């Protein structure tokens, strides 16, 4: 907080600020770059490069739309997650055989939990 002429200003100063010939910015030879989002690469696939179907967010598995050993095709509904009382469909990313369907209707589920393998 600075006063100029008594006017109150709130001023944010960068730590690597250098004006009037100042030094000390990036002191040890720091590199700065745009930080990567906390998500998987997301180009063309995320987890979908693998066989596992994983829950995209925390919720409740209110509907299971497949059975153990069913053949499915990309885009087919696998489960519905109730979250915030919104219903979110989780859907097959590839064709294959539903293998190791790990969940039952009404199970609580967490982001990244494996639902099934399309194998």
Q: Which positions touch other proteins (CB under 8 A)?
A: 1-14, 16-24, 27
Q: How far is the CB of 36 from other proteins (least distance, A)?
A: 16
HSE-up of 38 (CA within 13 Å, CB side)? Answer: 0
Q: How far is the CB of 37 from other proteins (least distance, A)?
A: 17
- Which residue number, 18 or 108, has a Cβ lying nearer to other proteins? 18
Q: How far is the CB of 2 from other proteins (least distance, A)?
A: 5
Q: How far is the CB of 26 from other proteins (least distance, A)?
A: 9
In angstroms, rounded to a whole number, what is the distance separating the alpha carbons of residues 98 and 66?
A: 8
- Which residue number, 24 or 42, has a Cβ lying nearer to other proteins? 24
Alpha-carbon radius of gyration of the chain: 25
- Which residue number, 22 or 69, has a Cβ lying nearer to other proteins? 22
- Which residue number, 7 or 85, has a Cβ lying nearer to other proteins? 7
Scanning 13-118, the segments in alpha helix (DSSP H) are none
Residue 90 near residue 72, CB atoms below 8 Å: no
Q: Cα dihedral angle (33, 39, 43, 46), rounded to 10 degrees?
A: 150
């Amino acid at each position: 907080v600075v006063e100029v002429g008594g006017r109150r200003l709130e001023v944010s100063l960068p730590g690597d600020l250098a004006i009037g010939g100042g030094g000390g910015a990036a002191a040890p030879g720091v590199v700065r770059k745009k930080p990567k989002p906390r998500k998987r690469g997301g180009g063309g696939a995320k987890a979908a490069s693998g066989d596992a179907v994983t829950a995209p967010m925390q919720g409740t598995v209110v509907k299971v739309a497949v059975e153990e050993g069913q053949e499915v095709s990309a885009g087919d509904l696998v489960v519905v997650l109730e979250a915030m009382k919104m219903e979110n469909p989780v859907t097959a990313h590839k064709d294959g055989t539903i293998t190791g369907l790990a969940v039952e209707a009404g199970a609580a589920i967490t982001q990244g939990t494996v639902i099934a393998e399309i194998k």
